[PDB]
Design a protein around this nucleic acid. Sequence first.
RNA 1: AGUAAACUGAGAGGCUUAGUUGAACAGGGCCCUGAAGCGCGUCGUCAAGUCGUAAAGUGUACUGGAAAGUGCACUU
Lengths: 263, 208
Amino acid sequence: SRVLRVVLLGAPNAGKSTLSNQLLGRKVLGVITEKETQVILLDTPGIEDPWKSMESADLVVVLVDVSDKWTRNQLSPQLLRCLTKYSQIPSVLVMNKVDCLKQKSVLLELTAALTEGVVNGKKLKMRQAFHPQRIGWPHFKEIFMLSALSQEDVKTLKQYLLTQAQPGTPEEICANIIREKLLEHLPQEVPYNVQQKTAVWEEGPGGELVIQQKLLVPKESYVKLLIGPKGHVISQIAQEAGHDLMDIFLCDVDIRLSVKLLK
Amino acid sequence: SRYSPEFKDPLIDKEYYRKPVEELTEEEKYVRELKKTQLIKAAPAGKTSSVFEDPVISKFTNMMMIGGNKVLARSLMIQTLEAVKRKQFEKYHAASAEEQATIERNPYTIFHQALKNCEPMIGLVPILKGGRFYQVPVPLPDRRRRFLAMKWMITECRDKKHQRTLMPEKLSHKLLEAFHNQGPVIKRKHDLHKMAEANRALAHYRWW
RNA sequence: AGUAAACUGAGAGGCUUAGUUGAACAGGGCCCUGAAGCGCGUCGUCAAGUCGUAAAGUGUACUGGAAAGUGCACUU
Ligand SMILES: [Mg+2]
Ligand SMILES: [Mg+2]
């Protein structure tokens, strides 16, 4: 039996949660068991929790968003401190959201900047033209270039991680799905200010799951945004939410969404 | 080109045309009917319907050509095949009863397996940005690796360290070395596989 | 592609024409016009230049870590 504790570090919106979900194969600490290997992924908040996770880490996966022009050119100082104090733990660089890059050859230069020209103890000599606060981390064991959103080559990282292993409520679910749909469809802060209240949850005469959920908001403009033109917006949400539920509980579900102002 | 865009390449395969109408799929049937309408180019000097035709040996001969001298290139190729055949017969006649079952005497099998043993799987492609060409590992296509095996064999046989040893004898010896996973060409394949593992930093660029 | 390379002839007296043999490679993206689409965007100052340069809001109260912040009430 082989086990590997891997901790995900990086910027807030570097996609750590997305990559963890893709590795797990489900949108959810996570455990990936395959044959005789067990990989424990520890998702940490973006930059006390990351350091405490490092205290029990066998491998570190440093995610960098290449699409973000502001932060792609350097590793954040706190991340560099984290790696320096735990230099003994192996670290692997993952350049996420490559699909968003228009000119992807840029990646190459970024590597030289992020790895300081050294990877896995070997220098990255590169044909050289015609003749202090650290910016990178020269002790990365390996480099990956992937896009977690499209699952592009996440399988390669999964197989790599498997290789480095060393011998050794339903109402809540429905609320989470509705929250996801609200986030996807509603603008700005509105989906963060919607309170949900389960009104009816029962089994109908035909074996279906009859759900009536109430969407409470503090403002009338939020009600208008929720209902949308001619009731389209809310309607769309319900159907999509219902469709997701079709796959989660494996039955027929009649979900009805009603919007009321918080008094 | 003196040919119009309309003209299509000919298909010299002889067993393709004898395929019975019954085995024809609707798609293959449609292709057969479509070729009836098209204009076809004259078959070039070279490939024929002969059963001894071998495209790989033809390409090797063309790659040994210098100055359009095809007679000499083919003469060298047939001399090499004859030398391989004679050396294997020599080794077979001097071998024990139990070593004779594992001695290959067909020069074509030896040539094909020797070239297959020299094909690389990975290579390096330079890419341009920042003023610095970047050497990224790349999985070679089948055409590229088949070409590289032949090019390495011919360059190894053209080395000037082989003073007055005639090309057929050098090439037969090199082919028989590569048949057994030995020689400088196998080492040149290994030194590229190691120099591509030494540079796995840029190992995932998929858009060379 | 009869292309590169190799080899012959004819001329006007380094240049013009006629032949023979005859390859290898043949994949990714741009500059720039072409084809359209979205957005943005609609500068300041001492005496004018003989100057320089490219969730969000509205009120009110307090503000002694005020290049504006917080508190209370409202609007989309
Ligand atoms: Mg204050
Ligand atoms: Mg205020």
